[PDB]
Amino acid sequence: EQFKQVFKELEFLGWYTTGGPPDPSDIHVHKQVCEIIESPLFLKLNPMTKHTDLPVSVFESVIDIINGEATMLFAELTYTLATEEAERIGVDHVARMTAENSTVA
Amino acid sequence: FSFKKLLDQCENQELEAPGGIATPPVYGQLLALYLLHNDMNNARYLWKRIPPAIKSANSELGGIWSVGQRIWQRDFPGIYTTINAHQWSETVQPIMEALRDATRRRAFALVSQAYTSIIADDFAAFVGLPVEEAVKGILEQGWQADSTTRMVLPRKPQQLARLTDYVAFLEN
Numbered sequence: 001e002q003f004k005q006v007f008k009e010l011e012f013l014g015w016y017t018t019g020g021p022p023d024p025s026d027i028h029v030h031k032q033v034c035e036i037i038e039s040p041l042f043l044k045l046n047p048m049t050k051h052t053d054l055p056v057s058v059f060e061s062v063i064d065i066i067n068g069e070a071t072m073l074f075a076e077l078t079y080t081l082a083t084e085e086a087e088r089i090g091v092d093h094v095a096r097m098t099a100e101n102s103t104v105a
Numbered sequence: 106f107s108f109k110k111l112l113d114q115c116e117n118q119e120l121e122a123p124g125g126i127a128t129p130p131v132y133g134q135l136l137a138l139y140l141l142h143n144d145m146n147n148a149r150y151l152w153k154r155i156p157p158a159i160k161s162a163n164s165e166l167g168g169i170w171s172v173g174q175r176i177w178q179r180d181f182p183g184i185y186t187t188i189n190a191h192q193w194s195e196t197v198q199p200i201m202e203a204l205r206d207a208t209r210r211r212a213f214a215l216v217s218q219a220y221t222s223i224i225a226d227d228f229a230a231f232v233g234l235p236v237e238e239a240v241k242g243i244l245e246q247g248w249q250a251d252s253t254t255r256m257v258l259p260r261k262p263q264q265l266a267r268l269t270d271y272v273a274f275l276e277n
Binding site for chain 2: 102103104
């Protein structure tokens with residue numbers, strides 16, 4: 001209710017968490033987040049990535065068709081690199097500029 | 106090169122002496138070497154450094170000093186005439202002629218630079234060679250000479266680390 005009066009065309013989309021792989025804790029939190037919207041997103045940020053999968057990742061809950069106690073799966077979805085001209089120029093400017101690390105380094 | 110080690114050997118020989126005065130042959134060799142390297146200030150100071158008695162005892166020192174005065178006044182034609190007046194000792198027989206060659210090269214420089222047109226007689230006097238060296242000017246070196254006027258025309262002939270050092274110095 002606080003942010004709806006500042007961002008008009010911006011509604012709930014999902015939740016983000018920093019960590020490793022999607023664990024049972026993540027699916028437990030998603031089991032609560034899913035009561036707000038039909039399909040919340042998940043955005044994992046892993047700063048310690050040294051493997052084949054990308055450090056940042058997007059997941060979606062998929063309701064499995066397995067009979068009995070069906071534990072929903074977490075399917076990874078790709079993302080694009082769409083960026084406006086203005087914001088791209090802004091990040092370009094912030095990257096061009098520099099600065100206890102040495103300047104020459 | 107070997108010249109550096111030879112100069113080091115002469116420095117060692119000069120460093121220690123039985124009474125501060127060395128043998129006349131090595132004194133003459135040192136004076137000739139000083140004349141060879143155009144280090145004329147140390148050459149004349151060595152000449153006055155020699156005691157008068159031993160200086161007057163031997164005429165080889167007198168001849169070496171006369172060569173030194175001839176090269177001190179930059180009298181190029183007379184350098185060769187004086188160097189041929191006396192006969193040097195055998196152990197320095199081939200090297201002194203080499204000194205002459207060095208002076209030769211010196212004169213060549215003084216003609217290549219500081220002379221746009223040089224009289225043939227003056228050029229021959231400077232280089233010492235009477236008439237034949239003139240030929241060496243055109244046929245081999247590549248100059249262009251003309252007759253009936255005797256006017257010789259000479260022709261005039263690892264980092265990134267450093268910048269990192271500069272930035273490291275300036276940033277701190």
